[PDB]
Amino acid sequence: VFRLGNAYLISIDEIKAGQATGRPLSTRKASACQLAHDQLVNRLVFKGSAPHK
Amino acid sequence: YENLFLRPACPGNISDTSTYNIDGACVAQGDIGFGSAVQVVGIVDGVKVVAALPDGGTPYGIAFRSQYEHLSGKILDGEVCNVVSHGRVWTLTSLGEAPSLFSKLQFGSGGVVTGGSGSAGWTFAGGFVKHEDGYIIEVQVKQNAFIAPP
Amino acid sequence: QINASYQRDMAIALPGMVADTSKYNIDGACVVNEGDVLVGAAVQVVQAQAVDGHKLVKALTTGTTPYGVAIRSHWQTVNAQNQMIYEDGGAINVMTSGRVWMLSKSTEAPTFGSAVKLDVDGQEKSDGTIETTWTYAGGWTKYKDIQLVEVQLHQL
Amino acid sequence: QINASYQRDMAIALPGMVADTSKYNIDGACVVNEGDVLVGAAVQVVQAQAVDGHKLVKALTTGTTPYGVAIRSHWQTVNAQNQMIYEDGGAINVMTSGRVWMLSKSTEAPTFGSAVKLDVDGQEKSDGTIETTWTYAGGWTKYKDIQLVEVQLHQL
Amino acid sequence: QINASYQRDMAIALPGMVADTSKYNIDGACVVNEGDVLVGAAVQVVQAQAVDGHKLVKALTTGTTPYGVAIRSHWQTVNAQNQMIYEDGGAINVMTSGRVWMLSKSTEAPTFGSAVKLDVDGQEKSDGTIETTWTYAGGWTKYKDIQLVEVQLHQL
Amino acid sequence: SALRVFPVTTELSPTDKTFEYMTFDKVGTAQIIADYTDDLPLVDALGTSEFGK
């Protein structure tokens, strides 16, 4: 078995600006993280990783 | 405003709770023992491939002890590995007596400390105890101290 | 009359983005002076106020000493020439330690752990004239017609 | 009758005070029986324990390498001249990295980025004989009959 | 106390404004080509489309023949460099005959009924190099450090 | 005494970064005319703005 991980950063000014203008940024960053995780799983299934055997 | 000390002095573990950094996205080629220096042989997809220190290499970090990742007793080929890149850590040594405080250490083959007269690099931190008819020393690892030769 | 499914991959980096969450340090008590600064380029410190404490920074020029790299921010930056910049007389986010994605002008991958040499414009070059103490951290990718490199920085 | 309203500004710093919160590193030690150490002045290490690494520190003397700078903390006493000091027997907090306000006895403001030279007693001097890795940070202030200067401290 | 009342006079003219309601003619089937035109300055025609009918105009340059003067419009103009201009690739009004106020670089009042000499950049200036067939209409005033002159234009 | 000597307003949202204000002006003239006249003068108006951070 193996494990995955990633993260992102955000600031108070950006949070307030998103809440004011109607479009946030944390939602987009979380969507990007989830999509990256899913593509990593698919790439692991179909292409493997020689150093990880 | 002070820094706490850490309890068990075994090789391969951290000795203080000062500023430290652990690079956990790595894989091993060959076998590595806890408390030895490692070098970076290549990079694949944001992952660093590490091996035990040869002659002529530049050390990058020190293998770190974990009780879930390494159930055998050492790090095995094809395993995800923890490497300490910044902080104070207990290292295996072949020396006989403690060197001068804040001197410059030198690494023999296999990632063991054998010199205390280097020009630049990691420094001795003042800890010197005994393990298994051999000794353990305390090293202070810094991030950009050793630079790969062009 | 048979279905099909396709696959596409996101890009990895972007000019001025922090590479990861390692031990880092950001100075936000600096102010841009005498021009503008491009996100993803080194900056230099002209002078530091003795009493007020705000540092004065500007773009890198020949014969100077680099201090840090401006990073990305969706709130503090200003949009111009189809990219994010820092205008004159505005707070800037300089990076003094950590891994950062910088612009590059080279054509080949660099060696891990080697020293970084910059150009007179603050952009990475394999044979630049300005020598630093920062290192290459291994990352080497390319956006759309933009070449980036992942660089480890420590305090000056 | 004309109403009046007055104004007065606060001081900037105190001797030995931490300047800002940029990635500091403070450790505890024990003061050697010989001599007192002034808060805001450099210290030296004479012996470190082998079991764990606890260190014994005293005031700086000629031909020795400094370790850190004494800072304000909970344990600290008053001398005859109302100077704040660390006693011979007790615990001491020493900063090994970061920005700190440290005593100076020169007369002209130092330049940013240059090295810091100390005197025999462990205070800043523009032309001292002790060479150190620490750097000037640009802050230069004057408490009542006291000079202070801001120093960047690198881990040894 | 005793009250007071004041008096003020409005300005006379503006750059690129129709001087009065004499017999005029304004061509609007032109398009700006390769650059932008300042309101109140002369223009030139580079090419007239035979089948489409539009006329390509641009700023006056040395060794050419001027065709008209652009006039003010609050709808078909764009604010740029604190002035009002005609941007690239858009319709433009060009006055081909009549009285109009235009920018000037001269320093003395002109003589009624004399010939008009334009400078290389398309602004009226005595002792200039480019010769025209227009006339001065007896108007000479300044709007807050901007010199304006009144010119009568006969159609080419 | 800076907050007392000068007025204090409340018009900016906590997320706005710049503000702008406008100004207007006009020109014109008049003349003594006769019954048959085709040379009456004209008038026009202006506009200006400033910025703050």
UniProtKB/TrEMBL annotation, chain A:
Highest taxon of source: Viruses
Name this protein carries in UniProt: Major capsid protein
Origin species: Escherichia phage FCWL1
Automatic annotation (TrEMBL), chain B:
Source organism of the structure: Escherichia phage FCWL1
Protein name per its UniProtKB record: IgG-domain-containing decoration protein
Domain of life: Viruses
Lineage: Viruses, Duplodnaviria, Heunggongvirae, Uroviricota, Caudoviricetes
UniProtKB/TrEMBL annotation, chains C, D, E:
Highest taxon of the lineage: Viruses
Annotated protein name in UniProt: Decoration protein
